[PDB]
Amino acid sequence: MEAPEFKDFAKTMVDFIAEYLENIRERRVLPEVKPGYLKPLIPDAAPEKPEKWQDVMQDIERVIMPGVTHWHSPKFHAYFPTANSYPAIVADMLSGAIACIGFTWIASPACTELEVVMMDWLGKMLELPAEFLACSGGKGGGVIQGTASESTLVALLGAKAKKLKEVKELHPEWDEHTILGKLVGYCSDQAHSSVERAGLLGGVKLRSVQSENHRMRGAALEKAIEQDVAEGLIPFYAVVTLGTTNSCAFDYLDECGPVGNKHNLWIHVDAAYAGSAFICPEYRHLMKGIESADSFNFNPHKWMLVNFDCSAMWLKDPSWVPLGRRFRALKLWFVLRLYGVENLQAHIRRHCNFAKQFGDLCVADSRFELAAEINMGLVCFRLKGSNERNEALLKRINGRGHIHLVPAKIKDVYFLRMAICSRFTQSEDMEYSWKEVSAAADEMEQEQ
Amino acid sequence: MEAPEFKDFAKTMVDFIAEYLENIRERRVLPEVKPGYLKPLIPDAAPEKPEKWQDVMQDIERVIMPGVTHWHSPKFHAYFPTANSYPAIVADMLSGAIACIGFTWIASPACTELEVVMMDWLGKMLELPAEFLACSGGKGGGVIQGTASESTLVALLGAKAKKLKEVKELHPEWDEHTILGKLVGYCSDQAHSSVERAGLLGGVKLRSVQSENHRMRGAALEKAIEQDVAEGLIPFYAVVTLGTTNSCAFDYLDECGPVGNKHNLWIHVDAAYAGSAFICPEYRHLMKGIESADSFNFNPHKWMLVNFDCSAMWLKDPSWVPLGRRFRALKLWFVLRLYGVENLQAHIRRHCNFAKQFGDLCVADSRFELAAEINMGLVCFRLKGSNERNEALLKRINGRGHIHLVPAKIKDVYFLRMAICSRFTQSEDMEYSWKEVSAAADEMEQEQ
């Protein structure tokens, strides 16, 4: 394919994307086609000769779209938002043309320097401590990782190296294997499975700390640390979760961070989803204790309109664990510029207010109860009574094909989750979604 | 930003991308700007109000391009190609609009089903043994991973789980932990650092097997295995490399495979770069022994024109280790359709021929010697004499700013590498790059 054909194809795809997203409320949330539908529709081998882009383009509605899950439909409540925005789509077109994966070491000023400045822009937006800002002139700064799962692992590895070095310095006679066998990390029992992943891949012990009303307390963390010290183990790392995946609960960073500092554990803050809200002054209280953190992560590619991948991680000392891989700073720059801070804050606030609106509708119905306090864009709720009736309700709702919801469970309480996902959501969607839940419950009751 | 503005912006970016790539020979391979150039060019904080897309576009040539490394310039010889093609750019626009990270498990027909068919399309193009193909009705099939590094780890983790489940049966009195501590894997001393990474993250011992003429022999692998068993260790995994990063040498898969088979080690084949050549019948002999492999991986995102990320991995039983994440199948489909088999074959062949051409020009200069047999798109060469005079030469060439080359070292032999990276490369580029090397050597000689 030559440039003129590329231009015709690409500009046609621009038209297609705008048509798709601007009219997304027309799409059905349950696919009409059955598993196995695709193979029949396309040949069994690649073509020997080049096909026409117009024919590929025609195959998008014919072959692809019937089998697509519409994540950006305001009728679709996935686990958390998947960011999409027009500025990020345009940046990624350019990154596609000029970036590399980073196999051959990227020594390029633009990739690296834009990443440093964008992490400062975003760090200022979050009012992060100066120690995390490159422009403060210290050791601190940030990197854009691919995922929060990667960020958690990277921080665990940095913490591991740091503890290794410190324990060696103090005991030159001990070998690495002996030191490494003693290392223990900590996280809440509500922490994401990526922490467990990180413990396994990092080759260390991980302790789950029992949370209180879904939130990890400093005293519980400290108790856990002390027990392991009494066993001769070496606590080295703890993950504090701001916005748990099950119910968007917040660990007490203002307790746990100081506990970690006091005991010389690296404190990593996983705020993958909820961290986007910290650009709003009214939600910044939720990361009180941030000064105690060794590393902090959130994903703009969930709730801050930056298409995947974009997981923003700051460290007090970035060296302990590089830059411009994939030119991810380009989409971050485009979004921050073409939205501006005000519009991004408006986006967070609108979503919080929508979740509250839905929670108010829900609790007004005496058949239902919240399963957790409402936080951020997430409402956890259930019919009063049994788990099985709730399992039934969720099944019925998803089967009716007007909206989609997802379940979760915390210690024997099964509940339904409504997360605000689509950037196209409006308040009337909350009314629509609630009325659909209620209508489904009405139907269950009247199954005699 | 709304759709009409998005369309104006995106279509202007399409114009920009075509202009950039189609005239990429105009670009200087050495950045003119110095480190630190970027910060003074842009504001120190995000804008409160949204900016205009036109001002962002203006800033691409003003702020970004002065500091960009032009990976796709035919004057730039990085470690290996970074795939770029127009069909893949257009696929990624759509994927950006409709795909998700996979946080919420994609239960989506199109994403999953397209991945299966494309891996069969591609597996046929490589003439992989029927056992790796999903269309053969067996347990085998393929997944599109993000990187060869991830692929190698995933295979290691599968092999680990498989061995552990085997050893638990023959030693029901042994600890699970006792078994794990005994596990040992193998790779060539020329294998990529990603194998070491997999060993570390996989929590197993890894043995570097001494290569001969940069190639791992079956006997050397067997000797290392038997040595370890002799100390009560448990061999479980080996990586056979087809196209090493240093010199594009090929391990003896025909020897190593059966060695692994005999001693019950999972054999993973890392063909990340050179694997793209196996779509050509005349190069398929380089994976003789492929029947003996448990997994096989190469990256279309290096040498097969599929923009990152796209690492294609086949397994004889893919259940020892979740499809459709990021909808990577879409770009593979677009590339295979819009190039067709013949054009992709022609791409590989031209690059192999260009490398031979360059090698001929090099050896004709009696001051130079090849540092390895020419394979695929790579020539390894050096001035006869010291490593130090070769380091000077490389620095001199890169400093001259007409072409860019990279260095490598195999057991105290330092050498320069010319790999064909750019899809825009032409025959005369070989003459240009050779003449530049020779001119630098002249310029060096005429100095004392």
Author numbering:
A (entry chain A), B (entry chain B): 1 to 321, 349 to 475
What is the paper's account of this structure, in its own sentences?
Because the enzyme catalyzes the decarboxylation of other aromatic L-amino acids as well, it is commonly named aromatic L-amino acid decarboxylase. In insects DDC occupies a special position because dopamine is a key precursor in insect cuticle formation, eggshell hardening and is involved in immune responses. In this study, we determined the crystal structure of the typical Drosophila DDC (drDDC).
The structure of drDDC was determined by molecular replacement and refined to 1.75 Å resolution with excellent statistics. There are two protein molecules in an asymmetric unit, which forms a biological homodimer. The fragment of V322 to P348 of both subunits in the structure was highly disordered; therefore, they were not included in the final drDDC model. Each of the two monomers is composed of three distinct domains. The large domain (Residues 86–380) contains a seven-stranded beta sheet, and the small domain comprises the C-terminal part of the chain (residues 380–475), which folds into a 4-stranded beta sheet covered with helices on one side. Based on the above features of the structure, drDDC is a fold-type I PLP-dependent enzyme. The active site of drDDC is located near the monomer-monomer interface but is composed mainly of residues from one monomer. The cofactor PLP binds to K302 through a Schiff base linkage to form an internal aldimine, lysine-pyridoxal-5-phosphate (LLP). The PLP pyridine ring is stacked between residues A272 on one side and H192 on the other side.
